[PDB]
Amino acid sequence: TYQEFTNIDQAKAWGNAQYKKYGLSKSEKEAIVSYTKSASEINGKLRQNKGVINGFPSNLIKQVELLDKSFNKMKTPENIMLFRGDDPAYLGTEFQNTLLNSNGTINKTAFEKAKAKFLNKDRLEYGYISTSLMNVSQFAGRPIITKFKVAKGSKAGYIDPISAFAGQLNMLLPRHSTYHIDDMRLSSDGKQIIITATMMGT
């Protein structure tokens, strides 16, 4: 199965053990601390351009190339579960202002439709994907939590040390990854959607 971390201290210690062996260059370091400052713009942008880079500003082509190069030194030694909060727009423009009932919970119709659109499908992401070793308090409050199951040996780095705001168990997966949506259910208390997905690599 997949190591789901449950203790904040073994998680931070396990990240630390991984980070010390990376042997990253100082320019790859600068490129990451950058990435965590303006993550959404960069993904926001890469989405609209369907991953093709050849024609961007020089600042970004040198940045994105370095980010992709980092992942040669950053690999997980075991199957691992990573987490992520998301807002409604993540499901599509038709879910942006329909997904939440006024009382803060999920609309039962909106969820069924989303369930149908996405259950048992693959999904391709052009942005990098930012995740966390546990369901940290910074993002656990968004209406959509995703658990990713990530196979031993995959590209995945603990970039918490070189991140703008640290102590948030920050992991990064590479751009242009693909994943398959296994489950989509409502939480116990009805205010969330818990999605479960397997990283198909890429």
Q: Which residues bind ligand NAD (CB under 6 A)?
A: 36, 39-40, 43, 47, 84-87, 89-90, 127, 130-132, 139, 170
Strands 157-158 and 80-86: unpaired
Closest CA to 122 of 176, 180, 184: 180
Q: How far is the CB of 86 from ligand NAD (least distance, A)?
A: 4
- CA-based nearest residue to 134, from 167, 162, 178, 105: 167
CB of 78 vs ligand NAD, minimal distance in Å: 20
DSSP structural state of residue 153? T
Nearest residue (beta carbon) to ligand NAD:
84
CB of 175 vs ligand NAD, minimal distance in Å: 11
The b/e string for 105-124 (b: 16+ C-beta within 10 A; e otherwise) is bbeeebbebbeeebeeeeee
Tokens of 117: 């659109």
**Comparison of 118 and 139: residue with beta carbon closer to ligand NAD:** 139
CB of 143 to ligand NAD, least distance (A): 9
The nearer residue to ligand NAD, 2 or 139, going by C-beta atoms, is 139
Nearer to ligand NAD by Cβ, of 76 and 170: the residue is 170
Instruction: Find the shortest distance in angstroms from Cβ 39 to ligand NAD.
Output: 4
**Among 109, 92, 126, 121, which Cα is nearest to 195's?**
121
Nearer to ligand NAD, 5 or 90 (CB): 90
